[PDB]
Structure 1
Amino acid sequence: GRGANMPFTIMEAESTSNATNGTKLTPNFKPGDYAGEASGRSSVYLDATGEYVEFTLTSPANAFVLRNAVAENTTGTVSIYADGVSKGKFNVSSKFSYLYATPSTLGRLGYDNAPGAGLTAYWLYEDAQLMLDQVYPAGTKIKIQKDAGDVSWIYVDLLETENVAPPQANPDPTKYVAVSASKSIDQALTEFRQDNTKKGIYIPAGEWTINSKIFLYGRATEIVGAGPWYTKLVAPQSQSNTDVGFNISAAANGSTIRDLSAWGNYINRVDGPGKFIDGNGMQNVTVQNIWVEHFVCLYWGVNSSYNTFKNNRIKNTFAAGINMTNGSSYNVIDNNYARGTGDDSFALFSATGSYNVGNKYTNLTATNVRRAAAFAVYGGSDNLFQNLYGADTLTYPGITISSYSFGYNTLGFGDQDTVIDGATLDRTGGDFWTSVGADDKINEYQNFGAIWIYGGDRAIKNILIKNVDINNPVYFGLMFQSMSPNNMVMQNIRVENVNINNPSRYGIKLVVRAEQGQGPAYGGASFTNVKVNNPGISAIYGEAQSPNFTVTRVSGNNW
């Protein structure tokens, strides 16, 4: 792609190909700002009746997602036109946006939904979904326009366009018990469990209340919808932060959940509840072509192995998208798209079973990461992250590679490579933590590169980063750092075929003193065919001040 191959096309409102009579924001990297939080770090602000932005389809489309920002505590409309003819109205809302903190309390980002004295609003963008009754061809002018009766103002960030097939019917009424207006999901599952000839349940097109955790047990179960634009599982929207969805017991290992969407009612992060799917220790489960929003996470695996998450869309969550922890091995996380997660979009946390091993995180896109990293790997052995696209992180790297234990029981990285192979990272990095007494100080925070290689309190070894393009990172391309006083010696850290384009500070930073009490990096790293192009200050910082770290320039480096 790079990244996930999805049926929707993403088009930025601010593209020079798009006529507008509105106000195009100049880009910045500021959280809590309508430019800094936008995809591409820009949006088009429509602020008077008749203001519009005109997109042009590059593929046929009958369905649209508008990422936008409106005023706090408001709902309303904005209009959509095809070739100059009005065709409908998006339902735009800030119900799920606006999370409050202060510049020195970014640790609270996502947790606090109420405004207050001295508090700044963050997480300003949200989405509106709309299907039209015609497939419009590529080349159609799709205009988003603020007409009389629409919202007072709106920032238009991007438009998804998609040609959605008609809804898929029950695959076989004699094998899949249908949910219906008078038969709930739980009732259909009971009928399935008690009849050995059933393969599972079918959930038709429509909106279906999920007001509980729905338990899958008895045997492997198939849950099949009509397609994610059609089958909508809806948490009670007059409630907030209800822990609803599915919970897969061991007896239902081997289950499949596919072809549906789930619309949660979380308005802030809560730690504990809030994963759409629970499945501690689950095995052989497939989650495919589902679209989930407004949960804390899609899935947080705990010693969960041999599972497949494929073709999913994870948008606007309050913490991590998918995390696999504590022994989770041999999972296939393939061809998933995440936008707007509230912590690491796709993560692997290895802890004691010795390591999380054999996982394949492939063809993944993670953008508009509202806190933490697009991709994060904490220890492990023999895990692959391949064909990745990450962009527009608010506070942290595109890719975190860390051997910090966080106080848990872990051995760090193991004896087989953790591989990052094929990645494009656009406008990644950010500010987090504090930098009191730091070297190379530019603000009150620690400052994160597109890729952060952090030796923590556990072994940091066998890391291969290859075939990566890093475009316009906030600060740095590659950032290497060792936690003091542990000073774990980094071994077998290799970087190959990497382009670092226009970093504002340095192509590569060896962190010398992150904050008071911290020192430089230990071990070394090899660089082959690593190009640093147009750095703001210099290609590499910290080499002379890092006497315990050896930079090896194998060949092909312009620095």
Structure 2
Amino acid sequence: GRGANMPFTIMEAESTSNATNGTKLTPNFKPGDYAGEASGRSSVYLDATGEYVEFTLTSPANAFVLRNAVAENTTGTVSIYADGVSKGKFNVSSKFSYLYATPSTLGRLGYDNAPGAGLTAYWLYEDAQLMLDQVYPAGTKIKIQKDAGDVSWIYVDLLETENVAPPQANPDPTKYVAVSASKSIDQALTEFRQDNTKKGIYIPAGEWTINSKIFLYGRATEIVGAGPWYTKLVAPQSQSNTDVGFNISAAANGSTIRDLSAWGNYINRVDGPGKFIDGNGMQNVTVQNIWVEHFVCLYWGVNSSYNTFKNNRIKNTFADGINMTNGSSYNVIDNNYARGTGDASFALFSATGSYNVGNKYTNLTATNVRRAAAFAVYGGSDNLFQNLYGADTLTYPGITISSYSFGYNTLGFGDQDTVIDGATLDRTGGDFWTSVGADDKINEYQNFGAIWIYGGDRAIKNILIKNVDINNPVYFGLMFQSMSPNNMVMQNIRVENVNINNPSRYGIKLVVRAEQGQGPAYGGASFTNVKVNNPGISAIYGEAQSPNFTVTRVSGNNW
């Protein structure tokens, strides 16, 4: 792509191809800011009746997603036009946006939904979904316009466009028990469990309340919808933060959930509940072509292996998108799109079963990461992250590669490579933690590059980073750091075919003193065909001050 191959096209409002009579924001990297939090670090602000931004379709579309920001505690509309003719109204709302913290309490980002004395609003953008009753061809002018009766003001960030097929019917009424106006999901599953000729259930087009955790047991179960734009599982929207969705018991290993959407009612992060799918230790489960929003996570695996997450959309969650932990191995996380996760979009945390091994995170897109990294790998062995697109992180790297234990029982990285192969990282990095007494100090935070290679308290070894383009990172392209006093010697750390374009500070930073009591990196790394282009200060910082770290310039480096 790079990244996921999805049927929708993403178009930035602020593109120079888009006529507007509104206000185009100058980009910055600030959390809590309408530019800093936008895709592309810019939006078009519509602030008077008649103000518009005009998109042009590059593929046919009958359906649209408008990422936008409106005032706190408001709902309303903004208008959509096709070739100058009004065609409908988006339902725009800040119900799920505006999470409050302060610049020194970003650890609270996502947790606190109420405004208050001295609190700043973060996580300002949210989405509106709209289907029109015609497929408009490529080249159609799709205008977003603020008409009389629409909201008082709106920041227009991007538009998704999609040509959605008609809804798919029950594949076989004699094998899939249909949910209906008078037969609930639980009742259909009971009928399925008690009749061995059934393969599962079918959930038709419509809105279907999920006010409970729905348990899958008995045997492997198929749950099939009509398509994610059509079958909508809806948490009770007059409630907040209810733990609903599916929980897959061991008897239902081998199950499949596909072709539907799930619309949670979380308005802030809660740690414990809130994963749309629970399945601790689950095996051979397939989750395919589902679209999930407003949960804490899609899935948090614990010794969960041989599972497949494919073709999914994970948007506007309050923590991680998918995390696989504590022995989770041989999983296929392929061709998924995440935007607006509230913690790491796609993550792998290896812990004791020795390591998480054999996982393949492929063809993944993670953008507008509202906290933490787009992609996070903590230890493990023989795990592949391939064909990635990451962009617009609020507080942390595009990719974190870390051997810090967080107090859990883990061995760090193992004896087979953890591979990042093929990645584009646009405007990644950010500020987090504190930097009291730090070297190379520019603000009150620690400062994170597009890729952070962090040796923690466990072994840091066998890391291969290749075929990566890092464009306009907030601060640095590659950032290497060793936790003191552990000073774990980094071994077999190799970087190949990497372009680092326009980093504001350095192409490569070897962290010398992250904060009081911390020192420089231990071990070394090899660089082949690594280009640093137009760094703000210099190509590499820290080399002379890191006497325990050897930079090996194999060939092809311009620094």
TM-score by length of 1: 1.00
Alpha-carbon distance in 1 for matches of 2:374, 2:291 = 18
- Residue 100 of structure 1 corresponds to which residue in structure 2? 100
Structure-2 separation of matches of 1:304 and 1:115? 39
Partner of 2:171: 171
1:205 Cα offset (Å): 0.1
SS of the residue aligned with 1:481?
A: strand
**Local SS of the residue matching 1:190:** helix
The Cα offsets for residues 51-88 of structure 1, whole Å up to 9 and x where unpaired, read as 00000000000000000000000000000000000000
In 2, distance between residues paired with 1:52 and 1:341? 28
Could you give the per-residue CA deviations for residues 4-50 of structure 1, whole angstroms, max 9, x where no partner exists? 00000000000000000000000000000000000000000000000
Cα distance in 2 between the residues matched to 1:407 and 1:169: 49
Q: CA deviation at 1:301?
A: 0.1
Determine the structure 2 residue equivalent to 1:127.
127
Is residue 230 of structure 2 the alignment partner of residue 193 of structure 1?
Answer: no
Query: What does the per-residue CA deviation read over 1:452-482, in whole Å, with 9 as the maximum and x for residues that have no partner?
Result: 0000000000000000000000000000000
Q: Deviations over 1:251-297 (max 9, x none)?
A: 00000000000000000000000000000000000000000000000
Partner residue of 1:477?
A: 477
1:367 partnered with 2:367: yes
Q: For 2:344 and 2:166, locate their aligned partners in 1 and report how far apart those are by CA, in whole Å.
A: 34
Instruction: Kindly indicate whether residue 343 of structure 2 is the aligned counterpart of residue 346 of structure 1.
Output: no
After superposition, give the CA deviation of every residue in 1:96-153 in whole Å (9 maximum; x if it has no partner).
0000000000000000000000000000000000000000000000000000000000
* CA–CA separation in structure 1 for the residues paired with 2:503 and 2:405: 30
Cα distance per residue 1:209-245 (max 9 Å; x no partner):
0000000000000000000000000000000000000
How many residue pairs match? The answer is 559
Task: Give the whole-Å Cα distance in 2 for the aligned partners of 1:4 and 1:548.
Answer: 39
Whether 1:162 and 2:162 are equivalent positions in the alignment is yes
Cα shift readout 1:291-339 (whole Å, capped 9, x = no counterpart)? 0000000000000000000000000000000000000000000000000
In 2, the alpha carbon distance for the partners of 1:67 and 1:485 equals: 45
| Cα offsets for 1:386-424 (capped at 9, x unmatched) | 000000000000000000000000000000000000000
- Structure 1 residue 383: Cα displacement: 0.1
User: 1:434-468 deviations in whole A, cap 9, x for unaligned?
Assistant: 00000000000000000000000000000000000
Aligned mates of 1:166, 1:397 — CA distance in 2:
39
Look up the SS of the partner of 1:531 in the other structure: strand
Task: Give 1:355 shift.
Answer: 0.1
Q: What is the alpha-carbon root mean square deviation over aligned residues?
A: 0.1
Structure 2 distance, partners of 1:344, 1:143, is 33
Q: Secondary structure at the match of 1:470?
A: strand
Give the distance between the partners of 1:320 and 1:340, measured in 2 at CA.
10
Q: Distance in 1 between matches of 2:380 and 2:515?
A: 27
| 1:497 Cα offset (Å) | 0.0
List per-residue Cα deviations over 1:509-555 (Å, max 9, x = no partner): 00000000000000000000000000000000000000000000000
Aligned to 1:438: 438
Q: Distance in 1 between matches of 2:241 and 2:353?
A: 34
Question: What secondary structure sits across from 1:148 in the alignment?
Answer: coil
SS at match of 1:107: helix
Q: Deviations over 1:173-203 (max 9, x none)?
A: 0000000000000000000000000000000
- Tell me by how many angstroms 1:165 deviates: 0.0
Quote the Cα distance in structure 1 between the aligned partners of 2:117 and 2:72.
Answer: 15
- Match of 1:135, SS? strand
Looking at structure 2, the residues matched to 154 and 400 of structure 1 have their Cα atoms a distance apart, in angstroms, of 34
Q: How far does residue 494 in structure 1 lie from its aligned partner after superposition?
A: 0.0
1:473-510 deviations in Å (ceiling 9; x for gaps): 00000000000000000000000000000000000000
Alignment correspondent of 2:111 = 111
1:433 to partner: Cα distance: 0.1
Show the counterpart of 1:488. 488
2: distance between equivalents of 1:134 and 1:11?
20
Stretches of structure 2 that go unaligned for 5 or more consecutive residues are: none
Aligned residues with identical type, % of pairs? 100
In 1, the alpha carbon distance for the partners of 2:478 and 2:343 equals 21
Structure-2 separation of matches of 1:434 and 1:54: 42
Query: What is the aligned partner in structure 2 of residue 59 from structure 1?
Result: 59
In the other structure, the counterpart of 1:515 is 515
Q: Work out the CA distance in 1 between the residues paired with 2:124 and 2:517.
A: 36
Distance in 2, matches of 1:253 and 1:437, equals: 52
Q: What's the counterpart of residue 421 of structure 1?
A: 421
Distance 1:176 1:230 in 2: 18
1:187 is paired with a residue of what secondary structure?
A: helix
Distance in structure 2 (CA, Å) of the matches to 1:132 and 1:403: 49
C-alpha distance after superposition, 1:323-372 (max 9, x if no partner): 00000000000000000000000000000000000000000000000000
Partners of 2:473 and 2:374 in 1: CA distance: 13
Helix, strand or coil: the match of 1:191? helix
Partner of 1:504: 504
Q: SS of the counterpart of 1:192?
A: helix
* 2:9 corresponds to: 9
C-alpha deviation, 1:375, in angstroms: 0.1
Moved over 3 A (4+): none
The answer for unaligned runs of 5 or more in structure 1 is none
Task: Measure the CA separation in 2 of the matches of 1:85 and 1:342.
Answer: 37
- Mapped to 2, the partners of 1:233 and 1:123 lie a distance apart of 24
What does residue 290 of structure 1 align with? 290
Q: What SS class does the counterpart of residue 67 from structure 2 fall into?
A: strand
1:384 aligns with 2:375: no
Partner of 2:332: 332
Corresponding residue of 2:393: 393
